[PDB]
Amino acid sequence: KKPLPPTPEDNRRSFQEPEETLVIALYDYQTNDPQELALRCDEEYYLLDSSEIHWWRVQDKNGHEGYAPSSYLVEKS
Numbered sequence: 866k867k868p869l870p871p872t873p874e875d876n877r878r879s880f881q882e883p884e885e886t887l888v889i890a891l892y893d894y895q896t897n898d899p900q901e902l903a904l905r906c907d908e909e910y911y912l913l914d915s916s917e918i919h920w921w922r923v924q925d926k927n928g929h930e931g932y933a934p935s936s937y938l939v940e941k942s
Contacts, residue, residue, distance in 0.1 A: 869935070
């Protein structure tokens, strides 16, 4: 139905992470589905359910309800 697409190779270190539920996930994920707002690479993640080892869920603060995946995401702390 919908596997995981290819991703960029820029992962290196972390950044901050003192926030509460919000984090970062600096990754340029490509996505147009209005259910999962794509991802740029800035502090725009909130929940991020790790339940899925590839398709998480998140609710940014500006209703940017994206669903950051695991491959296009891996930059926090």
